[PDB]
Amino acid sequence: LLKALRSDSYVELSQYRDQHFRGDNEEQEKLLKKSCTLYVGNLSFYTTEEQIYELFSKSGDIKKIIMGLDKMKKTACGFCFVEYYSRADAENAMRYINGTRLDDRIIRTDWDAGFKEGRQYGRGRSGGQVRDEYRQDYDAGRGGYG
Amino acid sequence: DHLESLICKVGEKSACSLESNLEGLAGVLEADLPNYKSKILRLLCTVARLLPEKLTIYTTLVGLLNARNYNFGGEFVEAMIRQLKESLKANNYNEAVYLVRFLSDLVNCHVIAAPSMVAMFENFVSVTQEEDVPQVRRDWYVYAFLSSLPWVGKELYEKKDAEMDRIFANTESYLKRRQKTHVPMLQVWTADKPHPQEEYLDCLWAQIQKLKKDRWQERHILRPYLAFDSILCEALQHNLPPFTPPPHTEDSVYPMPRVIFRMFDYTDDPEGPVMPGSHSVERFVIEENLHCIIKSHWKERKTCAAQLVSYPGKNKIPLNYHIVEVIFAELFQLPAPPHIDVMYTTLLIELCKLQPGSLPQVLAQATEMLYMRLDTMNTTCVDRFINWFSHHLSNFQFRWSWEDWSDCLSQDPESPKPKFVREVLEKCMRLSYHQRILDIVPPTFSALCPSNPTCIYKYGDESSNSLPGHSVALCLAVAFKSKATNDEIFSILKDVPNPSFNPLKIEVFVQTLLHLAAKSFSHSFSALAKFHEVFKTLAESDEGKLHVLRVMFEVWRNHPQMIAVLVDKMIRTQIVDCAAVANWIFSSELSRDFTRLFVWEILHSTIRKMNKHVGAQSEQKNLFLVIFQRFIMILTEHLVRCETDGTSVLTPWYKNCIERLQQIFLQHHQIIQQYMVTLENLLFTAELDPHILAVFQQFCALQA
Numbered sequence: 001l002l003k004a005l006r007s008d009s010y011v012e013l014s015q016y017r018d019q020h021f022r023g024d025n026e027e028q029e030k031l032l033k034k035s036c037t038l039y040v041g042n043l044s045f046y047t048t049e050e051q052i053y054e055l056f057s058k059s060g061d062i063k064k065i066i067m068g069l070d071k072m073k074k075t076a077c078g079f080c081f082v083e084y085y086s087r088a089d090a091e092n093a094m095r096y097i098n099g100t101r102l103d104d105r106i107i108r109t110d111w112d113a114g115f116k117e118g119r120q121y122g123r124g125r126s127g128g129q130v131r132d133e134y135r136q137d138y139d140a141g142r143g144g145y146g
Numbered sequence: 147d148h149l150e151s152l153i154c155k156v157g158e159k160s161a162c163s164l165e166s167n168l169e170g171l172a173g174v175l176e177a178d179l180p181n182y183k184s185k186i187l188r189l190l191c192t193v194a195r196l197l198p199e200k201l202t203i204y205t206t207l208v209g210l211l212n213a214r215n216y217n218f219g220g221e222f223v224e225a226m227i228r229q230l231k232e233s234l235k236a237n238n239y240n241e242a243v244y245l246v247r248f249l250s251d252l253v254n255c256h257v258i259a260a261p262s263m264v265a266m267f268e269n270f271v272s273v274t275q276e277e278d279v280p281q282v283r284r285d286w287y288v289y290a291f292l293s294s295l296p297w298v299g300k301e302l303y304e305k306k307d308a309e310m311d312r313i314f315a316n317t318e319s320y321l322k323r324r325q326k327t328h329v330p331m332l333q334v335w336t337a338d339k340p341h342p343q344e345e346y347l348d349c350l351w352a353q354i355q356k357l358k359k360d361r362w363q364e365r366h367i368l369r370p371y372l373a374f375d376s377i378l379c380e381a382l383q384h385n386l387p388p389f390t391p392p393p394h395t396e397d398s399v400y401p402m403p404r405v406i407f408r409m410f411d412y413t414d415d416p417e418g419p420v421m422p423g424s425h426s427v428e429r430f431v432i433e434e435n436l437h438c439i440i441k442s443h444w445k446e447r448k449t450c451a452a453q454l455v456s457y458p459g460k461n462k463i464p465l466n467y468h469i470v471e472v473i474f475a476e477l478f479q480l481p482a483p484p485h486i487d488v489m490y491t492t493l494l495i496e497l498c499k500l501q502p503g504s505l506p507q508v509l510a511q512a513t514e515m516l517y518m519r520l521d522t523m524n525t526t527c528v529d530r531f532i533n534w535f536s537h538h539l540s541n542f543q544f545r546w547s548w549e550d551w552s553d554c555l556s557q558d559p560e561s562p563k564p565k566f567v568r569e570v571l572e573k574c575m576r577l578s579y580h581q582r583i584l585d586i587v588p589p590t591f592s593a594l595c596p597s598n599p600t601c602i603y604k605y606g607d608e609s610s611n612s613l614p615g616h617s618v619a620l621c622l623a624v625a626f627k628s629k630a631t632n633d634e635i636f637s638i639l640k641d642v643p644n645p646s647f648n649p650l651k652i653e654v655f656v657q658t659l660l661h662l663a664a665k666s667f668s669h670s671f672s673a674l675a676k677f678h679e680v681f682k683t684l685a686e687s688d689e690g691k692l693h694v695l696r697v698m699f700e701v702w703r704n705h706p707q708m709i710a711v712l713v714d715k716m717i718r719t720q721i722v723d724c725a726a727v728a729n730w731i732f733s734s735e736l737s738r739d740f741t742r743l744f745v746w747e748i749l750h751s752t753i754r755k756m757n758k759h760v761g762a763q764s765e766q767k768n769l770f771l772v773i774f775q776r777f778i779m780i781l782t783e784h785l786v787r788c789e790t791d792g793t794s795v796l797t798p799w800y801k802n803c804i805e806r807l808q809q810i811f812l813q814h815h816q817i818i819q820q821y822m823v824t825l826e827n828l829l830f831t832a833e834l835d836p837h838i839l840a841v842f843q844q845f846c847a848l849q850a
C-alpha cells in the first residue's frame with residue numbers, strides 16, 4: 001500500500017455540520033463516516049425524484065430519496081437526500097456524480113449523518129433553503145431572486 | 147512517511163531534470179541506508195509492484211543505489227524474488243507481471259545479469275510443457291515473458307540470442323496450439339474491418355515479431371538509465387537464483403484471456419503525430435501504461451485526467467487519441483470494465499476540461515466512429531455506449547448534431563443504429579423530460595423519441611360499465627381516498643367473482659392502488675408499504691405474483707423507469723420474488739419489449755439482489771437455471787423455425803437474444819462457474835443447436 005494510491009479526496013467529509021443535530025461533533029462525524037446517505041444541493045426546483053433516481057442509480061442501488069421541501073409552501077426548494085444500501089455505492093456517487101450536471105445545473109453532494117423528520121424542509125426564514133435568503137442573482141431554476 | 151514521499155514523488159513536476167532528481171534521490175537514500183534500509187527496501191519493492199507506469203524511473207533509481215552499494219542491490223533483488231513467489235502463491239498474477247518486468251529492466255540498469263533473466267524465462271516457457279493444466283495458466287507465463295521483451299529484449303538477445311531462439315521456438319509452437327474458443331465472446335465487434343479485434347497473445351506475439359525484426363529497437367520507452375552509462379557500466383551485477391514456477395493447484399486462479407480493443411489507426415489523425423501501428427510494441431506499451439495510470443488514480447478523477455495528459459514518451463504521439471481509445475477499451479471490456487462504468491463518463495469530462503482545444507473534437511470523432519460501427523457491436527458494449535453517451539450529453543446541454551445520423555431513419559427500426567438512437571433518447575428523457583428531448587432533436591427524429599410516460603387505467607374515464615369487477619374497483623378508489631385500512635380493503639375485495647388465487651381481485655387492487663399514486667415514485671412506494679399485508683395475501687401464490695407483475699405492466703408500460711423501481715421494491719419487500727420476475731421477463735406480455743434495454747436492466751438488477759441474499763445458494767442457483775432454460779427454449783424455437791421455414795437466423799431479434807444470454811455468463815461468470823457440472827450434464831449438452839451450445843463453450847474457455 002502507498003499513501004498516494006490511497007488518496008480519496010472526493011470521499012472526505014466537508015466542513016458542513018448540522019447545527020440542529022441533537023448531539024456532539026465527534027458523534028456527528030462518527031455517523032458521517034459510516035453513512036450511506038448523501039445530501040444533494042443546488043438542485044433546480046423542477047428537478048424530480050425520478051430524475052434524481054436515474055442519475056444517482058449510476059453508482060448503485062438507491063434505498064430512498066427524500067425531496068427537500070419549503071417548510072411553508074411544501075414544494076421542492078432545491079435539495080434532497082439520497083440513501084444507498086451500501087457505503088461503497090454512496091462513495092462512488094461522491095467520487096463521480098458530485099460536481100456534475102442534473103438539469104444543466106452543477107450539483108453538490110455531501111455526506112449526511114442520517115435522515116430525520118423535519119430535515120426535509122427549508123430552514124430559511126422564507127421557508128426555502130437558507131442559502132436562497134442571501135443570493136443576489138436571478139436563478140430561473142430557484143424561483144428568481146433571493 | 148518522509149522517505150515514502152520522496153520515492154513516490156521522483157519523476158513528477160520539478161524545476162530540475164529527471165536525471166538530476168534521480169541522482170539527488172539516490173544520494174538521500176544511500177545516506178539513510180544505515181538507519182532505514184529495511185524501510186527503503188520495502189518502499190522500493192512496493193513501487194515496483196504498484197507503480198508499473200513508472201518502471202524505468204525506479205529501475206534506474208535501483209541501479210544508481212546498486213552502484214553506490216552492491217550489498218543493498220543484492221538485498222533488493224532477493225526481496226523482489228520473494229515478493230514474486232508470494233504474489234503468484236496468492237494468485238496475484240496481475241501484479242506478478244509488473245515484478246517480472248521490473249526484474250527484466252533491471253538488467254538494462256546493470257543490476258541483474260542477463261543470463262539470470264534468460265534462465266528464468268526458460269523456466270517460464272517450460273510451463274507450457276506441463277500436462278493437464280489450464281490453458282490460462284500456460285498463457286500467463288507466456289504473457290509474462292513476452293510483455294517483458296519491449297524493455298529487455300535487446301539486451302537478452304545480444305547476450306544469449308542462442309538461448310533466446312530456443313525459447314522463441316517453444317513459445318511459437320505453444321501459441322500455435324492454443325484454443326481460441328473464447329475469442330468470439332470477448333470481441334467488442336465481430337467485423338474484422340476496419341480493425342480486427344485480436345486475441346491478446348496473438349497480438350503481442352506479432353508486436354514482438356516486429357520488434358525482433360527491427361533488431362529489438364523501439365521508439366517509445368523512456369530509459370533514464372541511459373544517461374548514467376558511466377556509473378552503471380562500472381557497477382557489478384547480481385545473479386538470479388534458479389526460478390521454479392509454483393505448481394498448479396485446485397486453488398490456483400489465473401487471469402481470463404483478453405481481446406485487444408482497437409478503433410484507431412494513423413489515418414484517423416492525419417494532421418497529428420504518426421500513430422504507432424496496431425502491431426508495434428510502442429502501441430502496446432502506451433496503452434498498458436495509460437491503463438496502469440487509470441488503475442492507480444481511478445478514485446481521483448481530476449488527478450487521473452492530469453496524469454493521463456502528462457504521460458511521457460521518447461517520441462511524440464497522438465496522446466489524445468490514445469487516451470480516448472484506452473478509456474473506451476476499458477468501458478467496453480468483456481466481461482467487464484476494470485472500474486465502475488460511471489467513472490469513465492466523469493473522467494472524459496475532466497479530460498475535456500484539461501484539453502479544451504483538442505480532446506472534445508477527438509471525442510466527438512470517436513463517438514461518430516462508434517456509431518458508424520454499431521452493426522456488429524456486441525449488445526453488452528452497446529448498452530454501455532448508450533448509457534455513456536446519454537449521460538455525457540446531459541452534461542453538455544444535450545447538444546449534438548443528430549442530422550449526422552439521419553442514415554438510421556431509413557433503416558429497419560430494429561437495426562442497431564436506429565435502435566441505439568431510440569435508446570439514447572429514451573435515456574436522455576429519464577435525465578430530463580419528454581418535451582425537452584422532443585425539442586433537442588430534428589423534426590425528422592420525432593418518431594425515434596420516447597412516448598409520453600403516462601399512466602394507464604382500464605377502469606378510467608374511458609372504461610365501460612361492462613367490465614369485470616368494474617364497480618368493485620370504483621368503490622376501492624373511494625376507499626383509498628377515505629384513508630382505509632387493510633382489513634377494510636379486504637372486505638371490499640370480497641364482492642369480486644372468481645372467474646388460493648383470484649385474478650380479478652388482484653387486478654382491481656393493483657389497477658386502482660397504482661392509479662391513485664401515479665404521481666411520484668414515493669407515492670407508489672408508500673402505497674405498497676401501506677397495503678403490504680394485502681399484497682402478501684393476494685400474491686401468496688406464484689400465479690398471484692406473476693399476475694401482480696402483469697397488471698402493474700399494463701398500468702405502466704409507457705413508463706419503463708416506473709416499472710423498474712416498482713419491480714425492485716416488490717422484491718425487496720417480498721411482494722414478489724426473483725423467480726417470478728425472471729418468468730415475467732420471458733412472458734408473452736413483454737414479448738414486444740423483449741429487445742428493449744429496460745427489460746435487461748430489470749433482470750440484471752433482480753439477479754444482483756439475489757446474489758446478495760445470504761444463505762440462498764439453492765434459490766440463486768435455481769434463478770440461473772430458470773433463466774438458462776427460458777433462453778435455451780426461445781432460442782431453440784427460433785433456430786428450428788428458421789430451419790423449418792428456411793428463414794434468416796441472424797435477425798435483430800436473434801442478435802439480441804443470443805447476446806443477452808452471453809451477457810448473463812459475462813456478468814456473473816464467477817458465480818456460474820460453480821454450476822459447471824450441472825450445466826454440462828443437464829442444460830448445455832451436445833443436443834443443443836451449436837449456436838446455443840457455443841455460448842456455453844465460450845464461457846468455459848474463460849478459465850479452461
Ligand SMILES: CN1CN([C@@H]2O[C@H](COP(=O)(O)OP(=O)(O)OP(=O)(O)OC[C@H]3O[C@@H](n4cnc5c(=O)[nH]c(N)nc54)[C@H](O)[C@@H]3O)[C@@H](O)[C@H]2O)c2nc(N)[nH]c(=O)c21
Nearest residue numbers: 016018039110111112119121122123124128129130131134
Ligand atoms: C447546505 N446543506 C443543507 N443541509 C440540510 O438540508 C436541510 C435544510 O437546511 P438549509 O435550509 O439548507 O440550512 P442549513 O441548516 O444547512 O444552514 P446553513 O449551513 O445554510 O447555515 C449558514 C449560517 O450562516 C449564516 N450566514 C450569514 N451570511 C450567510 C450567507 O451569505 N449565506 C449563507 N448560506 N449563510 C449565511 C446564516 O444566517 C446561518 O446561520 C437541513 O436538514 C440541513 O441539515 C445539508 N446537509 C448536509 N449533510 N450537508 C450540507 O451541505 C447541507
